[PDB]
Amino acid sequence: SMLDDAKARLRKYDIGGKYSHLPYNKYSVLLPLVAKEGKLHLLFTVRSEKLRRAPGEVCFPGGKRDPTDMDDAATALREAQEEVGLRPHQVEVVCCLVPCLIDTDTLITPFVGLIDHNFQAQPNPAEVKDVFLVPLAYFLHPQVHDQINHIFEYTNPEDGVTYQIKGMTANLAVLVAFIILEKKPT
Numbered sequence: 001s002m003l004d005d006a007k008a009r010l011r012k013y014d015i016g017g018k019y020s021h022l023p024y025n026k027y028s029v030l031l032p033l034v035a036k037e038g039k040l041h042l043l044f045t046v047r048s049e050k051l052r053r054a055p056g057e058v059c060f061p062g063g064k065r066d067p068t069d070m071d072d073a074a075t076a077l078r079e080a081q082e083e084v085g086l087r088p089h090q091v092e093v094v095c096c097l098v099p100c101l102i103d104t105d106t107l108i109t110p111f112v113g114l115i116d117h118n119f120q121a122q123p124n125p126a127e128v129k130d131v132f133l134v135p136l137a138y139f140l141h142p143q144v145h146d147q148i149n150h151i152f153e154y155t156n157p158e159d160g161v162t163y164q165i166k167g168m169t170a171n172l173a174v175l176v177a178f179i180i181l182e183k184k185p186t
């Protein structure tokens with residue numbers, strides 16, 4: 001099936017806990033995969049204008065590890081629950097992708113999760129201004145604008161709203177699209 005095939009592909013790129021004990025300032029993100037209308041989609045947030053870091057930017061749900069978290073995957077799930085109301089029974093964490101080094105002292109660990117079909121996002125306005133889906137296939141033929149650094153523009157056909165996706169968030173979206181969609185019969 002579509003979903004069994006995606007999980008099987010993702011498992012080949014899992015690094016597991018190989019870099020998880022290194023002494024960094026630690027953050028995790030969840031890359032949430034949603035199946036709709038027979039295609040895979042990624043779920044994105046727009047950060048609240050009130051936040052200190054990156055207000056109003058497009059990002060994946062996530063945040064800083066705390067002492068309650070059993071492991072780095074727990075960080076991602078706790079933060080996703082706080083931001084968009086995703087509960088544990090509604091997500092299956094399939095793998096841990098290559099981590100992102102930033103600021104000389106920080107390590108960001110990305111997890112891919114398969115989202116239940118009955119989940120409906122409940123944006124927490126203290127943290128998130130908006131939540132939206134983008135089909136995974138978009139990232140193979142994106143609409144690129146140069147700011148020089150490359151920026152993607154995605155327009156939702158439901159309402160005409162355009163979102164700018166860039167940086168680590170854009171890079172990770174392309175990586176997931178390549179892993180899941182490369183070399184597939186039609």
Ligand SMILES: CC[C@H](CO)NC(=O)Nc1ccc(Cl)cc1
Nearest residue numbers: 027028062063064102103106108
């Ligand atoms: C390279 C400098 C930039 C801006 O100052 N650092 C930065 O954006 N840090 C960061 C990003 C994501 C997360 Cl999750 C945690 C920290």
